[PDB]
Design a protein around this motif. Structure first.
Motif, PDB file in Angstrom:
ATOM      1  N   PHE A  65     -19.599 -40.438  10.272  1.00 56.11           N
ATOM      2  CA  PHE A  65     -19.126 -39.114  10.672  1.00 56.11           C
ATOM      3  C   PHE A  65     -20.137 -38.146  10.107  1.00 56.11           C
ATOM      4  CE2 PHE A  65     -14.997 -41.477   9.939  1.00 56.11           C
ATOM      5  CZ  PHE A  65     -14.701 -41.631  11.286  1.00 56.11           C
ATOM      6  N   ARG A  66     -21.120 -37.774  10.914  1.00 65.15           N
ATOM      7  CA  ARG A  66     -22.289 -37.051  10.397  1.00 65.15           C
ATOM      8  C   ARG A  66     -21.913 -35.765   9.648  1.00 65.15           C
ATOM      9  NH1 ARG A  66     -27.170 -38.299  13.213  1.00 65.15           N
ATOM     10  NH2 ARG A  66     -26.928 -39.779  14.962  1.00 65.15           N
ATOM     11  N   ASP A  67     -20.914 -35.063  10.170  1.00 67.86           N
ATOM     12  CA  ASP A  67     -20.490 -33.775   9.619  1.00 67.86           C
ATOM     13  C   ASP A  67     -19.590 -33.913   8.378  1.00 67.86           C
ATOM     14  OD1 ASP A  67     -19.436 -34.475  12.530  1.00 67.86           O
ATOM     15  OD2 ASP A  67     -17.684 -33.738  11.496  1.00 67.86           O
ATOM     16  N   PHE A  68     -19.271 -35.141   7.962  1.00 70.91           N
ATOM     17  CA  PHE A  68     -18.427 -35.343   6.771  1.00 70.91           C
ATOM     18  C   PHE A  68     -19.075 -34.669   5.568  1.00 70.91           C
ATOM     19  CE2 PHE A  68     -15.225 -37.652   4.363  1.00 70.91           C
ATOM     20  CZ  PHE A  68     -15.767 -37.722   3.092  1.00 70.91           C
TER      21      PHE A  68
HETATM   22 NA    NA Z   1     -22.412 -35.561   6.362  1.00 66.75          NA
END
Ligand code: NA
Ligand code: NA
Ligand code: NA
Ligand code: NA
Lengths: 58, 223
Positions: B154-157
């Protein structure tokens, strides 16, 4: 209410997403809180987030 | 809740089942938890036109005397909530009046940054599998807080904002319908179920309550 139509298929990656197919129609429940819109499918009656660029007004 | 067990009835008396309405079409459902007699905490993505909270429930499909059903009068969605990433997935719900304190209905009022590695527990009425219905009965499961790297996909985590929850080597996880429910660590609410993978493979992503405590305090003092 104005209906929106899917321009492409989409497969959910997060459980909060909706999946959908090109041609599917939606009512938009929350399009004002970011570029993913909470939508209700007129085909399935399921609710979830869709990427706003994948739909256009009917 | 996937891979969990049925809760002892009414053993988690702060648990709230939310029914969220929008005109005409079918309603949607989430969890929540009672933090004050007239405030429920839940996820921001659970918002809608009107919300009914059911407290005191175990089998949500069968009415009983422990139930207390209260209308929400004001929704306080976090003002920085962003739908593309689900950052700041937190909302306070003000109830029309106070709940009664009973064995089955009670608050979990708040008493530090919670590190990876500890075991925590989450409960809810969500699906017990990818293609399963929502659970009739309240379920709970014990899950490991993972290093934030376990949520890299989850890149935006964001580790400051969110907890990474559930050993990826197991099937145990929160899932659809569990959103808004509390993650308790040593009896304290530390997370809120937010989202996970469509295929239910853990870890799932929870809102880190500690980051939002000042905002929660502010809403409570003024309302
Ligand atoms: Na991230
Ligand atoms: Na959905
Ligand atoms: Na974005
Ligand atoms: Na009351």
């Amino acid at each position: 209410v104005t209906l929106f139509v899917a321009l492409y298929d989409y497969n959910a990656t997060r459980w909060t997403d909706l999946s959908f197919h090109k041609g599917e129609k939606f009512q938009i429940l929350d399009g004002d809180s970011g570029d993913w819109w909470e939508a209700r499918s007129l085909t399935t009656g399921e609710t979830g987030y869709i990427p706003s660029n994948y739909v256009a007004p009917v | 809740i996937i891979g969990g067990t049925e809760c002892k009835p009414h053993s988690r008396p702060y648990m709230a089942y939310l029914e969220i309405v929008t005109s005409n079409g079918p309603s949607k459902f989430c969890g929540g938890f009672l933090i004050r007699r007239n405030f429920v905490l839940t996820a921001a993505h659970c918002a809608g036109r009107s919300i009914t909270v059911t407290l005191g429930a175990h089998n949500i499909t069968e009415e009983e005397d422990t139930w207390q059903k209260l209308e929400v009068i004001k929704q306080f969605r976090h003002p920085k909530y962003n739908t593309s990433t689900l950052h700041h997935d937190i909302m306070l719900l003000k109830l029309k009046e106070k709940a009664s304190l009973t064995l089955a209905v009670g608050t979990l009022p708040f008493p530090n940054f919670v590190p990876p590695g500890r075991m925590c527990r989450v409960a809810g009425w969500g699906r017990t599998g990818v293609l399963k219905p929502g659970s009739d009965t309240l379920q709970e499961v014990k899950l490991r807080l993972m290093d934030p790297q376990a949520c890299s996909h989850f890149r935006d985590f964001d580790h400051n904002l969110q907890l990474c929850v559930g050993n990826p080597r197991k099937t145990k996880s929160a899932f659809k319908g569990d959103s808004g429910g509390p993650l308790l660590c040593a009896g304290v609410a530390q997370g809120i179920v937010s989202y996970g993978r469509s295929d239910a493979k853990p870890p799932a992503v929870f809102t880190r309550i500690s980051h939002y405590r000042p905002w929660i305090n502010q809403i409570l003092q003024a309302n």
